[PDB]
Structure 1
């Protein structure tokens, strides 16, 4: 928590009387930034995070045929994910011997765990939880780091809340009525401090057990419960769909200046 001074740095003065974006919302109503290209100066942010010796954990589950996605996923993470910072990849897999041997940059490591415990608390400062059937195509960096973040679902970012595919059955712990909801977050990319991520996954797991005891299974299971949690425990940042895109399904709209992390065709 003690933070050394930034060095002198030369960059454009912020413009108080020029909006950052005129096409999109860049702050939530609980004053959490919404991360779009143009909002952040990455040099400032990199300094702040490097001066804290920040370590980022990146977790992926790769079960059965999903092991095939690891090579592209890790290679492209090496090009685009937290470059310059300490990174610890945790690959959770039923096929440890099939994990590809990917060459890592300095300060980057990978653990294979055969299939949250406290090993994370001792090893990393932040945890980022993503799906493996994806590739990085542009910068994903410390601009996302915060106590708790969710990402806007790319199919729903323009939708009204009544059209969100939340769990709508009142018998479910994930239940959200039609007049509630900020955003529709996708399960494929969330994170935060280790403490906040473990709170979330603990809460989701308990709610999911309660539903199962009541003989009910939520519509988009993990994602429905994620959405309920983030409704009731507001994220400290929200990532734009730059951070979770499918170009084959959704193209490349003007509102996206960059496509950073995308579905594999």
Structure 2
């Protein structure tokens, strides 16, 4: 497969379509999903998706997340939803369509919501080693408080995939909300940084996602031993990781849009939107 076979960056000339390290930034209009659908079908790939729903997040977001994912996520390819909840009896078991199946795991609920978010890195890694590495070719790790609005397909696959955060995709790096304290493992000094990635979505092959989660959690543990906590928790760490280990593919803000920003010219077709105003 060649880059030209599926990627046409010139189709969206008003936005960044490729990074300095040659990672394509996938925007609506630049990808050929039909070509990729056929390419991946022939390889018989399976894609996984992890999602955590602890406490009130179960009834507030889980059903809406899964229902939309069933309809829009990697349509036409085998998909396995890995659902981590603290109360399985609470599990809305909706009806899944062709090529969709799931697996539910009961996890321990952390007390602080910040710890719930950060502990996902630990848990995801454990599950990748234990079973995901043997079940899928690519995996996406997502926040539950969002909904798929349109096709989110194979055009998003890659070794390591990062998501451009909706509010800062056009901002100058020094304005990014990176962890700015050198005592933290997530530290990124002013004058450095490529983009501000959203921890709500990231993925790639099981091996790469394992590294992303293992390193982010290591960083999280280190800060805890140094009596400090990154400004934006797992997201600060994720951004530090992607700075040191450049993602091979980046998804435009259309793949994780905040409607509270409105809908500017650059956002042509939203594939997923946030649930909350922050």
The answer for unaligned runs of 5 or more in structure 1 is 4-12
Paired residue secondary structure (1:103): coil
CA contact (8 A) 2:185 2:223 kept: yes
User: Does 1:36 find its partner at 2:48?
Assistant: no
Aligned residues: 252
Q: Deviations over 1:106-153 (max 9, x none)?
A: 221111100023200111111100011111111100011000011001
Please name the residue that 2:261 is paired with: 250
The answer for unaligned runs of 5 or more in structure 2 is 108-124
> Which of these two proteins has the greater Rg computed from alpha carbons?
1
1:67 is matched with which residue: 58, 73, 81? Answer: 58
User: Does 1:92 find its partner at 2:84?
Assistant: yes
1:135 is matched with which residue: 139, 143, 147? Answer: 147
Q: Deviations over 1:204-263 (max 9, x none)?
A: 11111111111111000100000000000000000000011111x211111111011111
- Give me the whole-angstrom Cα distance separating, in 2, the residues matched to 1:101 and 1:167: 39
Please name the residue that 1:145 is paired with: 157
Question: 1:134-213 maps to which residues of 2 (within 5 A)?
Answer: 134-213=146-225
Please name the residue that 1:260 is paired with: 271
| Gap change, CA 1:97 and 1:121, over 3 Å in 2 | same
- Give me the whole-angstrom Cα distance separating, in 2, the residues matched to 1:127 and 1:153: 19
Please name the residue that 1:239 is paired with: 251
CA contact (8 A) 2:7 2:30 kept: no
Instruction: Could you list the structure 1 runs, at least 4 aligned residues long, displaced by more than 2 angstroms after superposition.
Output: 13-16
Relative to total residues, which structure has the larger helix share, 1 or 2? 2
Please name the residue that 2:120 is paired with: none
Q: CA deviation at 1:15?
A: 11
Please name the residue that 1:9 is paired with: none
Q: Deviations over 1:14-68 (max 9, x none)?
A: 999x932221111110001000011111100101111111100000000000001
Please name the residue that 2:113 is paired with: none
